[PDB]
From a paper:
The RNA chaperone [name] plays crucial roles in bacterial gene expression and is a major facilitator of small regulatory RNA (sRNA) action. The conserved core of the [name] monomer consists of an α–β1–5 fold, and when these pack into a hexamer, three faces are presented for interaction with RNA. The ‘proximal face’ is close to the amino-terminal of [name]; the ‘distal face’ lies on the opposite side of the [name] hexamer, close to the carboxyl-terminal of [name]; and the ‘rim region’ or ‘lateral face’, which separates the proximal and distal faces, provides additional RNA-binding sites.
V22 and G34 are within the hydrophobic core of [name] monomer close to the distal face, and residues L26, V54, and V62 are at the monomer–monomer interface. We found that the [name] [name] mutant bound to the A17 RNA roughly 2.5–5 times more tightly than the WT protein. The crystals of [name]/pA4 diffract to roughly 3.0 Å, and the crystals of [name]/A17 diffract to 2.1 Å. For the [name]/A17 crystal, a hexamer occupies the asymmetric unit with 49% solvent content, and the lattice interactions are like those observed for the [name]/pA4 crystal, including the gap between proximal face stacks. These are unusual lattice organizations, and the space in both lattices is likely filled densely with the N- and C-terminal tails of [name], but these are comparatively disordered and could not be modelled. Focussing on the interaction of the distal face with the A17 RNA, we found that the interactions of the [name] [name] mutant are very close to those seen for the canonical A-R-N pattern recognition that has been well characterized by earlier structural studies for the WT protein. Alanine substitution at conserved residue V22 or G34 have a modest adverse effect the structural integrity, and the 3D structure of the [name] [name] mutant in complex with RNA was found to be largely unchanged relative to the WT protein. Indeed, V22 and G34 pack into a hydrophobic pocket and an alanine substitution could impact on the presentation of the α-helix 1 containing Q8, which contributes to both class I and class II sRNA interaction at the proximal face of [name].
Numbering used by the authors:
A (entry chain A): 5 to 69
B (entry chain B), E (entry chain E), F (entry chain C): 6 to 68
C (entry chain D): 7 to 13, 15 to 68
D (entry chain F): 5 to 68
RNA sequence: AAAAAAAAAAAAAAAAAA
């Protein structure tokens, strides 16, 4: 089955800073606030909506259980 | 399940937004409407933006 | 929706179709279906919608 | 109603030259020889297979 | 049914092939195998290429 | 399929792998795990690489 | 461009046979 939900849920739960590298190289830094089938909400100065199809990677700022 | 409430909030409040496309271009306007595949943005005219080409939607201020 | 928007075709407004690579294509929306839109300028060319980022009217429609 | 098969089949039937602009700007010129739901076959000396998902615009060298 | 006949023809005749990715990168090797979403190309090693990132599959010579 | 067993070869033999993204960036680490949409690449941290942004994945050595 | 471990982001190069 799926493993994307637990990976993002581990970061959202533990409040660990995360880097979302987009398909064009731009690195979004913030906190996973929520996510659904198609988007993730990244939080910093404001809460923005990132489309999953335009993400290449999601890197945790530190190892996560 | 949560994309609509996000965009919808931007429509209720009439808050300026900044849509970043997959190629880094930053479009700015007002979310007037949207459907499963596109978001209608406004400024001078009403332009139709395909969601498959949007990389990010940033509200100009917290809502 | 995208159909009532594209249906630009009626008012014969000139339109720009920005591609995902930044290229601007100016013509007129001649026709469309589920996947493509045909734009007219010198010939009727076929523009795939998956390569489209923005459809801007030259003026309020 | 499909607006795609007739457009390509007309370029095939009239053996009219074409230019396939890819999503990265590369312009491939050749002849539409065949196509299915996912690919077009462009022809010069060697027939190559082009994926539709990488195509941005298919344009005819002349009105068809 | 147009992809399968094409790739299999290069896989059967062992024809050197160029796989142009969507970002312009040109891979050169041989079509060892393929499935609905990937093509396994070969040279010093058998690398897996996703179809969604390929733009063209060109034979080194007519086939 | 042609990618479920392919990734598993790198997941079982612990061979360092290289993942090239659609934008040319080369990732490097070890296939920790994978599913229909993602691959976890390991090094300092275990990052989640989306398949749709993957063009190629080459084993660093013949497998 | 056999490939920039990655430009908090070019309101946008009618288009680099790559």
């Amino acid at each position: 089955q799926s493993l994307q939900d637990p990976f993002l849920n581990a970061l959202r739960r533990e409040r660990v800073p995360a880097s979302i590298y987009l398909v064009n190289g731009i690195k979004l830094q913030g906190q996973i606030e929520s996510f659904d089938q198609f988007v993730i909400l990244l939080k910093n100065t404001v809460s923005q909506m990132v489309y999953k199809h335009a993400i290449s990677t999601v890197v945790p700022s530190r190892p996560v259980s």
